[model samples]
Target chain A: PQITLWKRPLVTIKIGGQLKEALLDTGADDTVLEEMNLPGRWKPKMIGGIGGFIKVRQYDQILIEICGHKAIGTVLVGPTPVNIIGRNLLTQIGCTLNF
Target chain B: PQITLWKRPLVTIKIGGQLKEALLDTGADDTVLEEMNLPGRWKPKMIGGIGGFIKVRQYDQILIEICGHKAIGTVLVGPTPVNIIGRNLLTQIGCTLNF
Candidate 1:
């Protein structure tokens, strides 16, 4: 599937049966979500971006649906200003940067 | 041109006659650079990301070279952890998210 780049390139994603809009972050290494409550054991992790470092709860083996493609991976929930869908999930959908 | 997704997807870019590495940030709307002295008229602006909002100097009519493609646009400079190449310049290079 092809994804057109919008001003923000935001897309709907399903995580834990909840639909939310997230940024498709080709710059990010892992997916980061705004704080959400999920039933699972999580480990504390810190991720650094252009702004700085952020501490988050890393939930493993989570199912995430993006553009109708489902991917199971680690998702970090934290005090992020925006929800980010990183390359970890992008690769599952066979995404590439092309011209 | 095609860009393969790297772990960080860092690329060399030329701005203000200085060459630097910047992250290809599909999640970002505009390019943001770390503190750098650039000659031009600028306006005060703020941008928000996962970490938080940042105050920056928006420099316009700047020539930026990315992957041999040159673009003239607005570039924000301020206290940022990393340099970013946003959709503003990405569009000039005809970048697309493909599978």
Candidate 2:
């Protein structure tokens, strides 16, 4: 692939669940989760997000508290074709991983 | 918009630059930065990642040391639209926002 140069320090977060560990992506403005770990109808929407054009066809919302932090933003649902962590939470708490 | 439920805890990280603090979004799947703070021709590619479809142009890289942490990864170059923290860097480190 033609690897392009970008700004330093791409950030990522860990989204630990009852049965899985996934990295939450912020670049996505909408909330998304791996379709494999969720069910359809949690809320279905067209996801024009990462991985090119995808058919976002599932949904859900789970209360997520980062680390010892208070129960933060509610994470929205997404199809698990590839799990993604979008803006469903970040804007609420402006933070970057500590260097 | 019809709000949908999603998985808990969408992951996010901060990308701090010399004069700005931007949230690094992983869901974008590719590296992206705002266009206002960088020079073009550093690198150009199609951005099929965040904030819907975009021209996806521009590029540059700076040593973005997150909060108190030392440099962890190299930030790719891109338009100063919305900075994206892609997997190119994340899969290398494992972390989440401390509560």
The residue-by-residue lDDT of candidate 1 on B42-92, one tens digit each, is 899978743467789999978989877888888999987789988988887
Best-fitting candidate, scored by DockQ: 1
lDDT of 2 at A46: 61
- CA lDDT, candidate 2, residue B15: 49
Error of 2 at A45 (Å): 0.8
Interface RMSD of 2: 12.3
Compose the digit string of candidate 1's lDDT tens values, residues A1-95.
66555577788989886899998889888889988876689999978743466789999888888877888888999987789988887877677
Candidate 2 residue-wise lDDT, B1-99, digit = tens: 111223322233444434444444444445455544543345546555434555655444444443333334445554444445555444334433321
**Structure candidate 1, residue pairs in collision:** none
Reference-based lDDT, each prediction: 0.83, 0.43
Per-candidate DockQ values are: 0.60, 0.14
